[PDB]
Amino acid sequence: MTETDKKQEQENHAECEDKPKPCCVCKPEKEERDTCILFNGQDSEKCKEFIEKYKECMKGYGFEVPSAN
Template sequence: MPKGKEVDRVENKGEPQEVASRPKPCCACPETRKLRDECIVEKGEENCKDLIEAHRKCMKQFGYDV
């Protein structure tokens, strides 16, 4: 195996490149997360279903199933 690939696997902790390059869940979709969180605090979860779903869709684009 070429040395460069070996270094990549060590730096990525053996994860496929696709997984290693995506943002952490806490850093993905900050805009939809902020709107969702503010709505839940102010109006309650039951009144924010559209914003919750928008955030779920955004997270799914990064490969997270929440």
């Protein structure tokens, strides 16, 4: 029995989905980032500051991050 379509593609937003399985070691900074982008609008320094601080606090004895390298 054949079929027209079934397999879903599902693409990403821009590039690199990031975020593996954010365990319990990561939660507060996450809320701080969301709030920062909520009030600001990501139009403030691109909020890259929180991204770097996060990747810096996680890549070092933190947990795990896929990234795009």
